[PDB]
From a paper:
Acetohydroxyacid synthase (AHAS), also known as acetolactate synthase, is the first enzyme of the branched chain amino acid (BCAA) biosynthesis pathway, and is the target for more than 50 of these commercial herbicides.
As for CE, the structure revealed that the binding of BS is strongly affected by the loss of π−π interactions when leucine replaces tryptophan. This correlates with the loss of affinity (150-fold), this despite the fact that the two other aromatic rings contained within BS make numerous conserved interactions with the polypeptide the observation that there is only a small increase in B-factors for BS when compared to its binding with the WT enzyme. As for CE, the presence of leucine triggers the rotation of the heterocyclic ring, however, to a lesser extent. The results show that the W574L mutation abolishes accumulative inhibition for all inhibitors except for BS.
Numbering used by the authors:
A (entry chain A), B (entry chain A): 86 to 667
Write the structure that this text describes.
C-alpha cells in the first residue's frame, strides 16, 4: 500500500512523476550530479523523504558508484546526469555494466522535444550513442509514458541477464503537468516470451547421470552464481567436486575451503588450470568462456564433456560447443539437482578422492608464491595482512592492473557480493567510486579500496564525496610509481623498453610522486604512508581502527610481476611460473 | 623531402607505419595514455625523434588537452588511447570537438580483427558509438590501408568545417609487417566534389551594395572568423560597422577597440543585443545562429536583412532564413569585399556615425557592471586585474559556469586563438587540460586557467601532468564553494531552493572545502589563497612572476549573479539587468 505525497486527482510535474515512479520501485539511493537539463528532477528529489542523493564530483564517479551499489547488494543502481557533457561522462560506466551484467538504470536529462536534432546547447544524441553499450534505452516523448517506461527499465535491468538501461527525458517533459496512471501494462511481448523457464527434470537427471560416469570432474563457477551461494555449497557437499572460479565468481564458493581451486585463467593458479586441462567433465555454471579464461579454445578442456548452464541462450555455444546444455537460472538448476542427489544418494556412491588427491599434489607443488626483498613491502603480503586483520569479512573494490590480480589471489572471500572489480571492460578509476557505492549500500560493513597509483588518481576527486557524505571508506593504495600491468608486458615481450609507464617525476626519480597523503589532507581525510615491512601490520591496524575514511599509502618495489601468467591465446603448457623485472 | 628511419624495401610493423604516417603530416605532439591494445604504438613512438608524447593522467584529460592544442594554434590535435575503457573516456572530448568545430584526430587501439563482435576483453564497438559525435571514423581492416586512412583523417579534420576524426586500429594490424605505399590516392570523391569554391564577384558586389543602402548595420562575428583576424579588421576600417561577437568569436575583432560591441546573446551586453534588435542589415560571418544567441528566432533581428556566410552549406538557412547567402570561406569573402571597397571608396561614401552614436548612448547607459561588498573579492574585478597585469596577451582557458561568462565579459582579447572554452557542448573539467595543450603549443605564452571549484576538481588529476612536463600553467581558481551557474537559476526560477549545489562540507559550512592548496602541494606546485580585495593585486602579480606552474585560490561570495541575462527562448525585451541571491 504505497502512500503518495499527491492526491489521485492532482496534476503534478513530470519530474515529480519520475521521482514517485522511483519510490514505487523501492529506490532509496541515487547518484545525481545536477545540470541545466535536469534541475526539475533535482528539485523533485528534495521533496522526496525516502530517496537520498549522493552528490559525486564527476559523473563517471556517479555511474561507477552506482555499479558498486549494485555489485555489493543486488539492488539496481540508479545514477542521474544532465544532458550533453553529463550524459557522455556515463559512457565508461554503461559499457562496464553491460560487459559485467550489472543491473543499472541511468536517467539523463535532455533538451526539450522540439530541439532534438538541431545541434542545440548541451545536446548529444545519447540514445543513438549508447544503443550498443546498453541492454536497452528509451527516449520519453510524452509525460504519459513515464510510469510505464520506468517500470520497464527496472524490469529489463534486473531480470534475465542483468544490464544497464538508459532513460533520456527532455526538459519540457519534466515541466509538463499530468496525472500518472500507475496501472500501465508493460510493452515487452517478445522479451517476456523468450524468458527462460524453470529447468526440466529430463535435463537435470542427465547431468547427475554424467557426474557418476565421470572420474575427473571440475566445477567452472562464474559471475552468474552469486545469488546461488548456498545452493552451490550444498551441491559441492553431495558431489565433492573441486571448484574453480573466474574473476567475477570470487566468493560464490569460499576460497578458504579445502575443495577450492581458487581462480583459473590467464593469471589463475597452476592447479586450477591443471584441473581443467586434464578433466573429463566440466560443469560451467554462470560463465561466458572468456578468452581470459580459455586462451586457445581448442586446448581448453580438450578431453572433457562440457556442461553449460546460462540464463542467456545467446551465450550457450558461442565460443565452446557443449555436450549437454541448460538455458535457465543456475539457482534453480542447483536446487533441482540437489534433490536428485539426496534421494539417490546411496544409489550413486560418489567419491572423487583420487581426483582430489591428484590435484592436491599439484596444489602443493605449484602454489601461489611471492618473494620478499629485504625490508621492502611485497604487495601480496600487504593483502594477506589485510585478509588477517579483517578476517576476510571486508568488501573489496579494486582498480585495474597488478594490484587487481593480487587482490584476487591473496584474499579469501567467503561470500559473494564481496568482490567489486571491473573484469569485462577493465576500466581504471573504477575502484574508489565503487567503494563509495558499496559503503552506502552496506553502512555497517568494512569497505576497503585496493587501488594503484595510476587507477587511484583518475577519479581522485571522489575523496571529497567520501568526506562530505562521511563514509568509512578505507583506501589501501599500493603505490609502485608505475602502470604495473603495462610495465610487466614491456619486460616480457618488449625487452623492458619503457614507453610512458612511469608516473613519478623524472627530475626527482627517487621521490614518491604524487604525495598522495596531501590529496587526502585536502579533503580532510586522515592519511599515512608505510614503507618498511615491519611497520606494515601496525599501519593497517591503524587504518581499520580509525573511525571514518582513511588512506594508507603502501610503497612497493615496481619490479614485481603477477604470476602465474598464461600468455595471450596460449595453452596450459605455455604457463609462466617465474620471472620479474630485475 | 621527408627522411624515413626505414629503407624503402624494409618491412616494418604496422605501428611503425602509423608513427611515420604522423611524422609526414607534421605532427610533433601527441597525448597518448598507454594500454594493452596500443603498446605497439607506444613502442613505436619512442623510436621517433620528432614526436613528443605528453602522458596525461586520464584519457578525458588527453583529448581535452588535444583540443586546447588545436584551439590555441590551428594545428590538429592528436590523442591516442587504448581499446575499451580508454576509448570510451574520449567520448566527452569527441562530442565537444564536433560541436565547436575543432580539428581533432583520435587514434584508439582495438582487439585483433578476428575478435571484434565477441564481447572480447576491453572490447567496445567504438566505431558504432562515435559515429554520431565525429565528422568521420574508420576501422582499419588491413595494414595496407594505414597510409591512406591517416591522410584522409588529417584532411577531413582540418578542411571545410573542422571536426574530430577517429581511427580504430586492431592490435594484429599494429604487429603485422608490410611495406607502406605513400603514393595512395584518397578515396573521398563525394566530399571533395561538394567542397566550397571561392566566392563569386556576383555575390560579393551585392553585399557591398546592401551595405550602402543600409542605415543601421551590425556585424555578427563567430568562431568561423579566427583565421580571418586581419581581413576582418581591414573590413571594419572601410565600413565602420560595429562588431558583435559570439562566445566562440572572441578575439576575432579586438575587444579594446571603440567599435566593439563585445559579446551578444543570453549573457551578452545590453548594447550588443540592442544593435541586433534594431538593425536593418545583419552581417553574420562564421556563426551558426545558436539559441544561446537568438532565443526566440522570430524576434531576433526582426527588422533586418540577413547576410550569412558559412563554409557549411547545411548551416545556411537552418534556423534563420537569410536574404543573401554565400557558401564558402569567410576569409576569401572578406578579401574580395575589401577590394571592392578600396576601388569604389569615394563612390560609396560610407558613414554610420549616427548609428554608432545611437549605440554609444546605450553603451554608456547599460555597461557591464559589478558590485563590491566590503573587502570581499568580486570575481569580475579579479579578471580585470588579471587583464591589467598580463596586458591582455594571455591565453585563457576556462571551465563551464559563472566564472566562464565572467572570463568572457571582463577580459579584452586582442587576437583570436587566445580564448579556449567549451561553448557548444559546455563540458566541465575542460579548462585545466586545455591549458596543458595550449602551453605545449605555445611554450613562450602566458597560459592562465580560470576554473571554478566544481570544474577544477573534475580533472584535478592533470596537475601531476603539469608538474611532470614542467609547464608554466597558471591556475586562477575562482572558488565560490558552489556550482554557480546552477545555483543562479535556482534563485531566479526555483525560489532559491538548494538542490545539491553546495560543494563544501556541511559539517564545517564556513570552511573552504576542499583545501585546493594541498592539491597543488601534492603535485609539488606552489600555491596561495587570497581572500581580501586589497591583497588581490599582489597575489596575481606573484602568480605571474613565479616561474613554472602556480595555483591561486580566489575566494568569492557565492551570491553573485552573471548579468545581463536574457532567459531561455526570450526576446531582448525580457532582458534581466539587475539581481543577485541576497
Ligand atoms: C587485467 C585483467 C586480468 C583478468 N584476468 C582474468 C583471469 O585470469 N581469469 C578470469 O576468469 N578472468 C580474468 N579477467 C576478467 C575477465 O575479463 C572476465 O571478467 C571473466 O573472465 C569473465 O567472467 P565470467 O565467466 O564469470 O562471466 P560474467 O561476465 O560474470 O557473466 C556471467 C555469466 O553468467 C550468466 N548469468 C548471469 N546471471 C545468471 C543467473 N542468475 N543464472 C544463470 N546464469 C547467469 C550470464 O549470462 C553470463 O553469461 C581479467 C580482467 C582484467 C581487467
Ligand atoms: C554556460 C554557457 C553560456 C553561453 N552563453 C552564450 C552567449 O551568451 N552568447 C553566445 O554567443 N554563446 C554562448 N554560449 C556558447 C554557445 O553555446 C555557442 O558556442 C555559440 O553561441 C555559437 O558559436 P558560433 O556562432 O561562433 O558558432 P561556432 O560553433 O563557432 O561554429 C562556427 C561557424 O562558422 C563556420 N565556419 C567554420 N570555419 C569557417 C571558415 N573558415 N569560413 C567560414 N565559415 C566557417 C562553421 O561552419 C560554423 O557554422 C554559451 C555556452 C555556455 C556553456
Ligand atoms: C546549467 O546552467 C544552464 C545554462 C543554460 O544556458 C546558459 N541553460 C540551462 O538550462 C538548459 C539546459 C539545456 C538546454 C536548455 O535549452 C532550453 N531549455 C528549455 O527548457 C524548457 C527551453 C528552451 O527554449 C529555448 N531551451 C536550457 C535552458 O533552459 O536554456 N542551464
Ligand atoms: C587471444 O589473442 C589475442 C591477441 C592479441 O593481440 C595480438 N590481443 C588479445 O587480447 C587483448 C586485448 C586487449 C589488450 C591485450 O593486451 C593486454 N592483455 C591483458 O590481459 C590480462 C592485459 C594487458 O595489460 C594492459 N594487456 C590483449 C592481449 O591479451 O594481448 N588477444
Ligand atoms: C581507463 C583505462 N586506461 C588504460 C587502461 C589499460 N591499462 C593500464 C594503463 C594499466 C596499469 C594500471 O596502473 P595502476 O598503477 O593503476 O595499477 P598497477 O600498476 O598496480 O598494475 S592496466 C590496464 O588494463 C585501462 N584498463 N583503463
Ligand atoms: C560535466 C558537466 N556536468 C554538468 C554540467 C552542467 N553545469 C554545472 C554543474 C555548472 C556549475 C559549474 O560549477 P563551477 O564551480 O565549476 O563554476 P561556477 O560556480 O563559477 O559557475 S554549469 C553547467 O552547464 C556541465 N556543463 N558539465
Ligand atoms: Mg601502479
Ligand atoms: Mg563554482
Amino acid at each position: 500500500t504505497f502512500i503518495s505525497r499527491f492526491a489521485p486527482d492532482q496534476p503534478r510535474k513530470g519530474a515529480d512523476i519520475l521521482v514517485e515512479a522511483l519510490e514505487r520501485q523501492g529506490v532509496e539511493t541515487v547518484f545525481a550530479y545536477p545540470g541545466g537539463a535536469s534541475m526539475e528532477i533535482h528539485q523533485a528529489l528534495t521533496r522526496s523523504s525516502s530517496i537520498r542523493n549522493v552528490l559525486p564530483r564527476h559523473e563517471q564517479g556517479g555511474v561507477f558508484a552506482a555499479e558498486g551499489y549494485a555489485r555489493s547488494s543486488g539492488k539496481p543502481g540508479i545514477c542521474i546526469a544532465t544532458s550533453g557533457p553529463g550524459a557522455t561522462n556515463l559512457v565508461s560506466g554503461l559499457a562496464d555494466a553491460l560487459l559485467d551484467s550489472v543491473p543499472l538504470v541511468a536517467i539523463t536529462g535532455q533538451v526539450p522535444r522540439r530541439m532534438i536534432g538541431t545541434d542545440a546547447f548541451q545536446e548529444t544524441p545519447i540514445v543513438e550513442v549508447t544503443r550498443s553499450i546498453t541492454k536497452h534505452n528509451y527516449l520519453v516523448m510524452d509525460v504519459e509514458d513515464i510510469p510505464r517506461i520506468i517500470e520497464e527499465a527496472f524490469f529489463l535491468a534486473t531480470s534475465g541477464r542483468p544490464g544497464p538501461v538508459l532513460v533520456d527525458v527532455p526538459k519540457d517533459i519534466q515541466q509538463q503537468l499530468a496525472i500518472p496512471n500507475w496501472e500501465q501494462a508493460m510493452r515487452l511481448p517478445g522479451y517476456m516470451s523468450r524468458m527462460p523457464k524453470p529447468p526440466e527434470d529430463s535435463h537435470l537427471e542427465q547431468i547427475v547421470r554424467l557426474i557418476s560416469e565421470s572420474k575427473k570432474p571440475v566445477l567452472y563457477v562464474g559471475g552468474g552464481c552469486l545469488n546461488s551461494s548456498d545452493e552451490l555449497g550444498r551441491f559441492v557437499e553431495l558431489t565433492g567436486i573441486p571448484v574453480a572460479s573466474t574473476l567475477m565468481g570470487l566468493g560464490s564458493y569460499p576460497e578458504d575451503d579445502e575443495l577450492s581451486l581458487h581462480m583459473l585463467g590467464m593469471h589463475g593458479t597452476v592447479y586450477a588450470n591443471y584441473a581443467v586441462e586434464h578433466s573429463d567433465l566440466l560443469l560451467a555454471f554462470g560463465v561466458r568462456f572468456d578468452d581470459r579464461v580459455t586462451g586457445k579454445l581448442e586446448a581448453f578442456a580438450s578431453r572433457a564433456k562440457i556442461v553449460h548452464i546460462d540464463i542467456d541462450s545467446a551465450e550457450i555455444g558461442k565460443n565452446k560447443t557443449p555436450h549437454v546444455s541448460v538455458c535457465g537460472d543456475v539457482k534453480l538448476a542447483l536446487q533441482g539437482m540437489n534433490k536428485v542427489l539426496e534421494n539417490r544418494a546411496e544409489e550413486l556412491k560418489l567419491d572423487f578422492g583420487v581426483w582430489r588427491n591428484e590435484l592436491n599434489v599439484q596444489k602443493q607443488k605449484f602454489p601461489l608464491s611471492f618473494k620478499t626483498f629485504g625490508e621492502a613491502i611485497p604487495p601480496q603480503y600487504a593483502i594477506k595482512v589485510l585478509d588477517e586483520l579483517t578476517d576476510g569479512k571486508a568488501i573489496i573494490s579494486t582498480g585495474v592492473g597488478q594490484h587487481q590480480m593480487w587482490a584476487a589471489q591473496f584474499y579469501n572471500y567467503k561470500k559473494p557480493r564481496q568482490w567489486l572489480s571491473s573484469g569485462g571492460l577493465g576500466a581504471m578509476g573504477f575502484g574508489l567510486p565503487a567503494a563509495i557505492g558499496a559503503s552506502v549500500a552496506n553502512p555497517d560493513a568494512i569497505v576497503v579500496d585496493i587501488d594503484g597509483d595510476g587507477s587511484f588518481i583518475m577519479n581522485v576527486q571522489e575523496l571529497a564525496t567520501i568526506r562530505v557524505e562521511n563514509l568509512p571508506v578505507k583506501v589501501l593504495l599500493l603505490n609502485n610509481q608505475h602502470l604495473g600491468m603495462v610495465m610487466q608486458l614491456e619486460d616480457r615481450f618488449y625487452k623492458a623498453n619503457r614507453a610512458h609507464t612511469f608516473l613519478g617525476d623524472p627530475a626527482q626519480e627517487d621521490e614518491i610522486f604524487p604525495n598522495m597523503l596531501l590529496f587526502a589532507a585536502a579533503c580532510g581525510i586522515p592519511a599515512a604512508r608505510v614503507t618498511k615491512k615491519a611497520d606494515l601490520r601496525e599501519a593497517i591496524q591503524t587504518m581499520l581502527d580509525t573511525p571514518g575514511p582513511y588512506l594508507l599509502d603502501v610503497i612497493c618495489p615496481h619490479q614485481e610481476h603477477v604470476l602465474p601468467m598464461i600468455p595471450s591465446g596460449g595453452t596450459f603448457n605455455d604457463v609462466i611460473t617465474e620471472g620479474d623485472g630485475r
